[PDB]
């Protein structure tokens, strides 16, 4: 439903836990994008400069590292609207010229969720909270 | 007594205590060592199957045959018809042996002591005593197991 | 010695870092981020100007904060990549070109923010290893300052 | 004398225990008895007549069920004694003395029973192993049916 | 092929084994429905009263518990046509007003199978037996 | 990109490793085909003689054993164009009368890759090398 | 003894085989494949003709090679199937019919290529067990020669 | 003296053993020899002339192959002795005395060989680790090519 | 003899017994301790590489160089051309040392004893004896290894 | 050669590798599996002791008899008189079998590979080769073991 205060705390953690700290990260990433490009192989035409054809190459993993690295920045701020918006914003001016359809900001949302559930287990995963707050982060990159 | 509830129970406790593979041979050797210690005399009734030595394949095979039977009988506790058909089939095989029904009482205690000592404290002694009286009456016929 | 960032140095830095820097603790990050830049500036005055598009003069400006966190979160991504060097190289050069299109950014700029970290870490992170940390902080910046003026 | 390697008897005794033990509801035993004989007969109907006493007229009779059970019960004792050639050899000799001292029993009938089991069981057992069983089951058949014309 | 006598025994077991006894159940369920709604997200519009939007919530898990709990009742009777039909029937009068397409009674069939295979392993899973008998249970809820 | 000399060595190994030696093989196979028929259930109409309806039966596993067994023969020769072609050829005359669309020789290619990655792990899997050389083996069965 | 291919015999043959025969070693295969046929022919002369469509006379012909490897790779598939007999049967009979549509192929043909292996294996594979191997090589051919003339 | 940390030498020695050992068919060795030199040359063709004795004229000659093998064999002994600075230091001194007492060998040539290996190997090794190798391989290069103008 | 079948074999047994990393240094130290015990005298032929002490890095490096060579040579057993090219290259390096071919016989026994004692009972002594005669003849040339 | 020093040695290495109890049967089965793989043909020379199957008690007993002999022979290496008396006694038992002395060469390699692979790297291949030539010459007489 709504990305309230409580939901932002439970998300900060669940993410931090699943985003690991530098071991199962290369796997986290690979798991999300190998879901994005399966539900939307069309999308890979946007990551032409970062080898979207083969998500196994360094060049691309470096990309996904850059993406998920950003998703962090944001989640890390779901509990600070001020400095949060100031980033979601600094991110909006970066995905405008890339012509990204809001429909795509929703296929990645799901992939991320399929991966975080994958990492931390469905038994505990909280969707209404992950679906809620993730939206907030995308409806900020889309400039709102 | 020995209502179906206890029959389904004696089946589980048994299946568990009896085990499979080597377990079976081992369980049987303990049951018969129990019988011949409860009633030394009972032993001479089996000279034909080399009861002179319990380890001889002749006698191990007998053990395999009997408690092997006990297994099948108990396995039918939930089908009066079959159970009775086969419980009868045994009476005819045992009648001519002219066997004192008193040993069937020992086979009862031997059996109990072995299943109980193998299955652990939760052994249902009553359920077992009852439902075995059914097998004895079916085999011996003696009104001692009524 | 060799000064190389060895696999052991990597496991150690990665660990010490992991505890202090995570999305679990919003506020743990800010505190460190600011601390670093706040240490740079007071050591390299004519460096605030390099960060004008992000209010380098207003350490608390909601803009510079979002900045500070971005830079350090940048280091985070790298440290976590010490585990997969092939990728870390592709990622450290993309960061190299990206730091060249900026002005007054020098190999000497990093060397400062490097002392910046060496004096800041030991205050928040317990069990800090300046020597090991340094050998790997440097391993990372040498891939950033690839194409840069002293 | 020698039946099957140990690791074999093992695979067989495990799978067998999965579908045959005193903990199984009389409802399944019956289904197996029938299945096994309704398959033996369709292969050798000339053998159906051998089961008069056991009321083969009706395969649904507490009389006939007991018979399939004591047949399967004997095949229960063999599989579970595969690791003891000593006793197993005697157990199978004893079973031959009987199936032979009985009239009209042709060895080819057992072969029929073999193929039946080989075909029937894999429908009950998970990942049934045809080879392990063949190496263990064949010796049993021939040992039991040793003397049958 | 046909859901014979033999096939019903091997199914009773394989199910009982995979349906567990109360531990990996919450996972069994979650695995089946997270397959149903992936091959037919359309279907979730029928479980509106049991939160079909988020299969992670209690309300819904309670639902799936109710469903799979029923599937059991039935499998538990594949070896008793009398009391079996009497249940498949008592179930038919319950899914009529729910307007369920027989096509759907086949997407759930597969999901269940994808989960039972998942639990007990493909190496042993028996499809012709699971496809056969499962049909029989659905062609009874459909009133035949 | 191109199936060079280096790429053929790294593929020979990665395959041999994932193709196992006779243990996780029945699983290797089952994993590939249970991907082929999910992305192209249409295809199963060609394996009518080897029970393509239920990839769990012996008859079919025996088939997949025959297929993957061939894929081996080929990979085993990526480092011997002479005796290699002579096999890719001997294979072309065998899939002509079977009317196989080159589109299908590409759905199996991917399935194989989804399985080899599955066996040996994405962290090491080399796509550009697997996509490259696999093509070479199919553009030989297709008669070129 | 029984002569049956026991589960132990299977694990052993499978192992000894696995090491010597794998896509890892191209060349390890060729060497063995040729060796076998080259041993058959010099023991069963009027057998070369059975393999004319594959240049049985030219042991090095790029055609016979692709052959040799196919036959042995056939055995491989089987040996690996000793782990799943239900499947191995379906696979050994498909190979049976397939070897009947060929001419002069006899149960005695195999018995030769069988001695062929028993003298070749021990030279390349270490820790060879003729007895165990044989009990399972035979287990496989008895399913191939199902429908065949002596 | 000091080459690379232990856990490093470890990562390197493992990956190396994956693609280089006496159990590998002469067919691959050859492919590596060529690959490594056909890449060294395209980087420094001026160095191709140094391999006359080894018949560099033809890179497909049993003569030249042996040379790439003894080069790679020497680089086999270094990687496998990374955990023993003592002996490794001597082994690399011995290799310098030779590459130096040889005319026309420029240190920049080795640097070329380094970049070649760094680029070539990751095509053969799974999850090749550029860093571990750099920390271990560089010391080797400089140690071997210590004296080359 | 030493047909390709045995060559592919000696390669596997070797690669296995020789191991990698520290294994190599260790295997070599055992082989040379075998040589100097089979023929004490053979030792003085290596004074230039500090054979006074086998643990000195000077000598450990020699061991690394030689059996390091043995490794490469054996690694080419399946390529007559290369094998012979390099087997020749060694003859020239060893010819001037003026070495009695008898030691090459000891290096043979030392080698065998070490690979066999490291590889286990399945060591193919014959295959190994044959294919090593190939290396000796290629290096020494003495018709002692024919 | 095969001076007493090596004789006392081959005795220790042997006694060690041969072991006692089950060890013996096992060691022998490896030695003979080595012989029949070194020379497939050598096998048909033992049809009389059921060499069709190496696990048959007929053949296991043969193995027990032969290497059992090897044991005694080697055990006397330090007593020329006895050693020769019994080494002769064997020649007469083997002479009529009309056996190609070439197999005795295989028995040599088989033996070596098994003792060496069982005793570990310190196997003295030379000492063993020499002192076995003594046993072969004593049994076969062929000047092949001189
Ligand atoms: C094969 O042989 C069997 C022989 O039956 C078996 O062996 C016998 C020696 C007995 O020991 C049996 O226990 C054993 O099954 C033939 O089938 C059996 O035949 C009997 C008939 O005597 C079947 O019994 C049915 O009828 C009983 C009694 O019915 C009477 O009493 C009830 C009150 O309880 C009245 O309501 C009836 O009007 C009648 O007067 C009854 O308990 C069952 O019927 C009830 O339950 C059914 C539910 O299953 C309902 O559908 C009925 O409406 C009713 O309420 C019995 O059906 C006995 O069941 C069968 N056994 C089997 C396996 O079904 C069999 O015919 C023969 N094969 C052939 C055809 O050749
Ligand atoms: C680079 O140098 C090599 C030098 O070759 C290498 O070094 C030499 C010193 C030798 O030690 C070689 O073993 C080693 O490869 C040049 O290439 C080699 O050149 C030879 C020619 O002498 C190639 O050999 C081919 O021919 C032989 C013999 O052919 C004659 O005899 C056969 C009967 O066996 C007759 O059928 C022929 O008519 C002829 O009279 C033959 O064994 C091969 O040909 C057969 O096999 C082929 C299958 O691969 C078939 O396609 C043929 O139809 C025929 O049946 C050889 O092809 C030798 O192979 C090459 N080596 C290589 C790597 O191929 C090389 O030319 C030079 N580079 C350049 C061009 O500058
Ligand atoms: C979850 C929200 C997202 C975040 C936080 C995010 C973040 C980022 C960042 C930090 C970069 C690169 C910055 C640089 O180094 O220059 C980037 C690049 C990019 N992003 Fe996103 N992104 C998000 C969603 C998306 C979506 C949904 C798409 C569309 C399919 C997308 C497409 C791209 C492309 C095409 C690039 C450029 C890559 C390149 O430089 O070659 N992003 N994103
Ligand atoms: C309920 C328990 C018992 C069962 C299930 C049982 C079962 C059997 C069976 C199946 C046989 C042999 C059938 C054949 O030859 O094929 C047998 C034989 C025999 N039983 Fe029992 N029995 C039981 C109790 C007893 C008792 C208490 C005695 C008495 C001491 C006894 C004495 C014998 C004797 C003497 C034989 C003949 C053995 C021979 O010479 O072959 N049994 N029993
Ligand atoms: C090695 C540690 C460093 C890391 C990880 C790092 C990382 C980053 C990142 C991630 C950004 C923003 C990228 C984006 O907007 O998408 C950035 C921007 C920037 N960095 Fe760094 N940086 C480092 C050191 C430095 C140093 C030493 C200087 C020099 C004074 C510097 C100057 C800048 C400037 C001027 C910007 C642009 C800020 C803006 O957008 O207004 N960085 N850095
Ligand atoms: C290997 C599988 C078989 C086993 C384990 C087996 C076992 C048995 C056993 C335990 C008995 C009971 C003896 C007694 O009354 O004490 C029996 C009886 C009998 N068996 Fe079998 N049997 C097998 C196969 C067969 C076959 C293939 C036939 C023939 C078509 C057959 C025909 C009979 C007959 C006619 C009786 C006597 C029934 C009666 O008393 O009325 N058996 N069998
Ligand atoms: C495998 C066969 C199935 C069984 C055994 C089954 C069983 C059940 C049971 C026991 C209930 C709830 C009873 C209650 O507590 O009031 C239920 C409810 C329901 N079922 Fe099924 N069902 C099956 C298949 C399906 C299918 C294929 C659909 C359609 C997509 C479906 C849709 C529903 C709906 C919409 C409800 C009502 C939930 C609610 O009360 O909010 N069921 N089912
Ligand atoms: C990766 C490349 C492929 C290889 C190496 C391969 C190999 C083989 C082999 C060895 C056989 C059976 C030979 C026999 O025993 O008679 C076979 C049969 C067959 N293949 Fe393929 N195949 C490949 C791709 C395909 C593809 C893409 C399709 C199409 C969907 C296909 C369809 C078939 C069919 C329908 C059969 C006949 C099965 C039967 O006999 O019932 N194959 N293939
Ligand atoms: C048990 C071991 C054997 C195995 C595993 C085996 C396997 C095979 C295979 C896989 C093929 C080719 C199938 C295809 O083309 O798709 C084949 C072909 C053939 N095999 Fe065998 N085979 C064996 C023994 C024999 C024996 C003993 C003979 C008898 C002389 C024989 C004669 C042939 C012939 C004549 C062909 C046809 C070759 C051609 O296409 O020109 N095979 N075998
Ligand atoms: C680190 C990598 C290298 C290693 C391990 C290495 C190793 C060796 C070895 C073991 C030899 C043989 C000495 C002998 O004959 O006993 C050798 C020879 C030689 N190396 Fe290197 N080498 C390397 C790099 C280079 C480079 C980069 C060049 C120059 C372009 C080079 C040029 C030569 C030459 C010219 C010979 C003599 C060839 C002859 O005898 O005809 N090496 N090297
Ligand atoms: C086939 C086995 C052998 C191989 C592969 C081999 C290999 C080598 C190699 C590669 C070198 C040094 C090359 C360099 O300086 O770069 C060498 C040196 C030498 N070898 Fe051998 N060798 C073998 C057997 C022997 C034997 C049996 C002797 C005799 C006792 C021997 C005596 C020497 C001596 C005296 C040196 C010179 C050491 C020095 O002062 O540097 N080698 N050998
Ligand atoms: C030094 C090693 C050998 C020793 C100590 C040895 C010892 C013996 C002994 C003690 C016997 C049987 C005595 C008896 O019957 O009481 C025997 C029998 C025999 N040996 Fe040897 N033997 C040796 C080598 C060989 C070799 C190399 C061959 C040849 C292939 C061989 C072939 C035979 C044969 C054919 C028999 C007769 C077996 C029979 O039918 O009973 N022996 N040996
Ligand atoms: Ca959304
Ligand atoms: Ca259906
Ligand atoms: Ca393609």
Q: What is the 3-state secondary structure (H, E, C) of chain G?
A: CCCCCCHHHHHHHHHHHHHHCCCCCCCHHHHHHHHHHHHHHCCCCCCHHHHCCCCCCCCCCHHHHHHHHHHHHHHHHHHHHCCCHHHHHHHHHHHHHHHHCCCCCCHHHHHHHHHHHHHHHHHHCCCCCHHHHHHHHHHHHCCCCCCCCC
Q: How far is CA G102 from CA A65, B73, G95, G145, in A?
A: 59, 57, 11, 12
The rounded Cα B107 to chain-centroid distance in angstroms is 6
The three-class DSSP label of residue A30 is helix
Q: Give φ, ψ of I40 to 5 degrees.
A: -30, -50
The HSE-up count of residue B59 (CA atoms within 13 Å, CB side) is 18
With 0-12 / 13-18 / 19 or more C-beta atoms within 10 angstroms meaning exposed / middle / buried, residue D3 is: buried
* Nearest-angstrom CA–CA distance, G111 and G113: 6
For the record, the structure tokens of E22 come out as 């109360």
For the record, the structure tokens of H79 come out as 């990687």
Three-state secondary structure readout of A31-95: HHHHHHHHHCHHHHHHCCCCCCCCCCCHHHHHHHHHHHHHHHHHHCCCCCHHHHHHHHHHHHHHH
Q: Is B15 on the interface with D (CB under 8 A)?
A: yes
Q: Which residues contact G70 (CB under 8 A, 6 or more apart)?
A: F73, F87, F90
Three-state secondary structure readout of chain E: CCCCHHHHHHHHHHHHHHCCCCCCHHHHHHHHHHHHHHHCHHHHHHCCCCCCCCCCCHHHHHHHHHHHHHHHHHHCCCCCHHHHHHHHHHHHHHHCCCCCCCCHHHHHHHHHHHHHHHHHCCCCCCHHHHHHHHHHHHHHHCCC
* Nearest-angstrom CA–CA distance, B27 and B19: 8
Q: How far is CA H8 from CA H123, I22, J24, in A?
A: 20, 14, 46
The rounded Cα A37 to chain-centroid distance in angstroms is 14
- Looking up tokens 């491989």 gives G76
DSSP I48-93: GGTTT-TTSHHHHHHHHHHHHHHHHHHHTTT-HHHHHHHHHHHHHH
What is the CATH classification number for the domain harbouring F13? Answer: 1.10.490.10
What is the CATH classification number for the domain harbouring J117? Answer: 1.10.490.10
Q: How far is the CA of A103 from the centre of ligand 1 (A)?
A: 66
- Looking up tokens 């016929």 gives B141
* Nearest-angstrom CA–CA distance, D92 and I141: 70
Q: Is H126 on the interface with G (CB under 8 A)?
A: no
Three-state secondary structure readout of chain F: CCCCHHHHHHHHHHHHHHCCCCCCHHHHHHHHHHHHHHHCHHHHHHCCCCCCCCCCCHHHHHHHHHHHHHHHHHHCCCCCHHHHHHHHHHHHHHHCCCCCCCCHHHHHHHHHHHHHHHHHCCCCCCHHHHHHHHHHHHHHHCCC
- Count of domains observed in chain J: 1
Mutate-to-test residue for ligand 12 from J40, J70, J94, J135, highest number of ligand atoms within 8 A of CB: J94
CB D124 within 8 A of CB D19: yes
CB H117 within 8 A of CB H36: yes
* Nearest-angstrom CA–CA distance, I8 and A54: 38
| DSSP classification of residue A106 | G
CB I128 within 8 A of CB I140: no
CB A28 within 8 A of CB A19: yes
CA distance C20 to chain H (A): 25
| DSSP classification of residue I15 | H
Exposed e or buried b for every residue in B100-128, given b needs 16+ CB within 10 A? eeebbbbbbebbbbbbbebbeeebbeebb
Domain of residue E87 covers 1-144
Contact state of D22 with B75 under an 8 Å Cβ cutoff: yes
What region, left, alpha or beta, does residue E129 occupy, with left being phi > 0 and alpha being psi -120 to 50 degrees?
alpha
User: Could you give all domains of chain C from N- to C-terminal order, each with its CATH number?
Assistant: 1-150 (1.10.490.10)
Comparing CA positions, the residue from F100, I37, D18, B97 lying closest to residue J125 is: I37
* Nearest-angstrom CA–CA distance, C78 and A18: 18
Contact state of G126 with I3 under an 8 Å Cβ cutoff: no
Residues constituting chain A: 144
CB C28 within 8 A of CB C21: yes
CB I121 within 8 A of CB J117: yes
* Nearest-angstrom CA–CA distance, J10 and J127: 7
Helix (H) or strand (E) holding H144: helix H130-144
Residues constituting chain J: 146
DSSP A107-137: HHHHHHHHHHHHHH-TTT--HHHHHHHHHHH
Q: Give φ, ψ of H127 to 5 degrees.
A: 50, 40
For the record, the structure tokens of D117 come out as 């089991």
For the record, the structure tokens of C30 come out as 């800010």
Q: Give φ, ψ of D83 to 5 degrees.
A: -85, 10
Q: Which residues contact H27 (CB under 8 A, 6 or more apart)?
A: F79, F80, G26, G27
* Nearest-angstrom CA–CA distance, C1 and C13: 19
Closest partner residue to I20 (CB to CB) among H17, H25, H87 is H17
Comparing CA positions, the residue from C78, C70, C84 lying closest to residue C32 is: C70
* Nearest-angstrom CA–CA distance, H30 and I78: 12
- Looking up tokens 């004997």 gives D74
Residue E77, Cβ neighbours under 10 Å: how many? 19
Question: Radius of gyration over alpha carbons of chain H, in Å?
Answer: 15
* Nearest-angstrom CA–CA distance, G88 and I107: 49
* Nearest-angstrom CA–CA distance, G142 and G127: 25
With 0-12 / 13-18 / 19 or more C-beta atoms within 10 angstroms meaning exposed / middle / buried, residue F89 is: middle
Residues constituting chain C: 150
For the record, the structure tokens of D40 come out as 């033996």
Q: How far is the CA of F14 from the centre of ligand 13 (A)?
A: 40
Domain of residue J43 covers 1-146
Contact state of D11 with G7 under an 8 Å Cβ cutoff: yes
Q: How far is CA G36 from CA F94, H44, I56, in A?
A: 26, 47, 50
Q: Please report which ligand is nearest the Cα atom of B68.
A: 4
- Count of domains observed in chain A: 1
Q: Which residues contact A99 (CB under 8 A, 6 or more apart)?
A: A46
CB D3 within 8 A of CB D142: no
For the record, the structure tokens of I124 come out as 């193919």
Q: Is H23 on the interface with F (CB under 8 A)?
A: no
- Looking up tokens 């069982």 gives J118
CB A33 within 8 A of CB A107: no
With 0-12 / 13-18 / 19 or more C-beta atoms within 10 angstroms meaning exposed / middle / buried, residue C71 is: middle
* Nearest-angstrom CA–CA distance, C93 and C95: 5
* Nearest-angstrom CA–CA distance, C117 and C122: 9
* Nearest-angstrom CA–CA distance, H112 and B8: 81
Residues constituting chain E: 144
* Nearest-angstrom CA–CA distance, A12 and C28: 13
Please count the residue pairs, one from chain C and one from chain H, whose beta carbons lie less than 8 angstroms apart.
43
Closest partner residue to H7 (CB to CB) among C7, C89, C139 is C7
Exposed e or buried b for every residue in I8-35, given b needs 16+ CB within 10 A? bbbbbbbbbbbbbbeebbebbbbbbebb
Residue H108, Cβ neighbours under 10 Å: how many? 15
The three-class DSSP label of residue I18 is helix
Q: H1-149, which class in CATH? A: mainly alpha
Q: How far is the CA of I80 from the centre of ligand 13 (A)?
A: 67
> Which residues of chain G does H27 touch, with a Cβ-Cβ cutoff of 8 Å?
26-27
Q: How was this structure determined?
A: X-ray
CB C113 within 8 A of CB C40: yes
For the record, the structure tokens of B32 come out as 């018969």
Residues constituting chain F: 144
CB C129 within 8 A of CB C12: yes
Q: How far is the CA of B135 from the centre of ligand 1 (A)?
A: 26
Comparing CA positions, the residue from F73, F87, F67 lying closest to residue F25 is: F67
Comparing CA positions, the residue from C149, C70, C78, C68 lying closest to residue C110 is: C149
Resolution in A: 2.9
The rounded Cα A99 to chain-centroid distance in angstroms is 17
Q: Which residues contact G5 (CB under 8 A, 6 or more apart)?
A: D131, D135, G82, G135, G136, G138, G139
Q: Give φ, ψ of D103 to 5 degrees.
A: -85, 150
> In terms of CA atoms, which chain H residue is nearest residue I69?
H73
CB A113 within 8 A of CB A131: yes
Q: What share of chain C is helix, strand, coil (3-state, %, to 5)?
A: 65, 0, 35
Q: Is the dihedral of CA J96, J99, J100, J104 positive or negative?
A: negative
The HSE-up count of residue B135 (CA atoms within 13 Å, CB side) is 25
For the record, the structure tokens of D131 come out as 């080879």
Q: How far is CA C80 from CA A56, C12, F122, J66, J135, in A?
A: 18, 12, 18, 66, 69
């Amino acid at each position: 439903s709504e990305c309230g205060p409580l939901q932002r705390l439970k998300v900060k953690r669940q993410w931090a836990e699943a985003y690991g700290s530098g071991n199962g990260r290369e796997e986290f990433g690979h798991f999300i994008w190998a879901n994005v490009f399966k539900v939307a192989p069309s999308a890979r035409d946007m990551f032409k400069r970062v080898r979207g054809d083969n998500i196994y190459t360094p060049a691309f993993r470096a990309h996904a590292t850059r993406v998920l690295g950003g998703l962090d920045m944001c989640v890390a701020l779901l509990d600070d609207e001020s400095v949060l918006n100031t980033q979601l914003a600094h991110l909006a001016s970066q995905h405008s010229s890339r012509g990204v359809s809001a429909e795509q900001y929703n296929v990645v949302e799901h992939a991320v969720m399929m991966g975080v559930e994958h990492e931390i287990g469905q038994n505990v995963f909280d969707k209404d909270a992950w679906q809620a707050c993730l939206d907030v982060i995308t409806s900020g990159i889309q400039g709102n | 007594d020995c209502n179906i509830l206890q029959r389904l129970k004696v089946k589980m406790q048994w299946a568990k205590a009896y085990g499979f593979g080597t377990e079976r041979a081992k369980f049987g050797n303990s049951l018969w060592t129990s019988i011949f210690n409860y009633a030394p005399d009972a032993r001479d009734l089996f000279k034909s199957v080399k009861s002179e030595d319990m380890r001889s394949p002749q006698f191990k095979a007998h053990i395999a045959r009997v408690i092997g039977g006990l297994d099948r009988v108990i396995s039918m506790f939930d089908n009066e018809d079959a159970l009775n058909a086969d419980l009868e089939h045994l009476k005819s095989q045992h009648d001519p042996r002219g066997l004192d029904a008193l040993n069937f009482v020992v086979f009862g205690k031997a059996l109990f002591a072995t299943v109980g000592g193998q299955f652990g404290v939760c052994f249902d002694l009553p359920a077992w005593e009852s439902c075995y009286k059914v097998i004895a009456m079916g085999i011996t016929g003696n009104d001692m197991f009524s | 010695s060799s000064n190389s960032c060895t696999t052991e140095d990597r496991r150690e830095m990665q660990l010490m870092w992991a505890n202090v820097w995570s999305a679990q603790f919003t506020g743990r990050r800010l505190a460190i981020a600011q601390a670093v830049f706040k240490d740079l500036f007071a050591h390299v005055p004519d460096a605030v100007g390099l960060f004008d598009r992000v209010h380098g003069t207003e350490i608390d400006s909601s803009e510079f904060k979002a900045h500070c966190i971005r830079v350090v979160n940048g280091l985070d991504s790298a440290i976590g990549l010490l585990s997969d060097p092939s990728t870390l190289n592709e990622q450290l050069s993309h960061l190299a070109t990206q730091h060249q299109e900026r002005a007054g950014v020098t190999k000497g700029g990093f060397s400062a923010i490097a002392q910046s970290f060496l004096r800041v870490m030991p205050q928040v992170a317990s069990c800090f290893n300046p020597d090991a940390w340094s050998r790997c902080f440097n391993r990372i910046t040498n891939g950033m300052t690839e194409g840069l003026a002293e | 004398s020698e039946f099957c390697s140990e690791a074999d008897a093992t695979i067989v005794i495990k799978q067998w225990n999965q579908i045959y033990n005193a903990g199984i509801g009389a409802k399944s035993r019956w289904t197996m008895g029938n299945e096994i004989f309704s398959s033996l007969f369709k292969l050798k109907p000339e053998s159906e007549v051998l089961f008069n006493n056991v009321n083969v007229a009706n395969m649904s009779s507490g009389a006939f069920h007991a018979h399939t059970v004591r047949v399967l019960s004997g095949l229960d004792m063999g599989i579970n004694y595969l690791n003891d050639a000593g006793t197993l050899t005697s157990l199978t000799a004893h079973l031959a003395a009987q199936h032979v001292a009985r009239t009209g029993l042709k060895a080819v009938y057992f072969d029929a029973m073999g193929k039946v089991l080989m075909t029937v069981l894999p429908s009950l057992i998970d990942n049934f192993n045809p080879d392990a069983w063949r190496n263990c089951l064949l010796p049993l058949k021939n040992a039991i049916a040793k003397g049958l014309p």
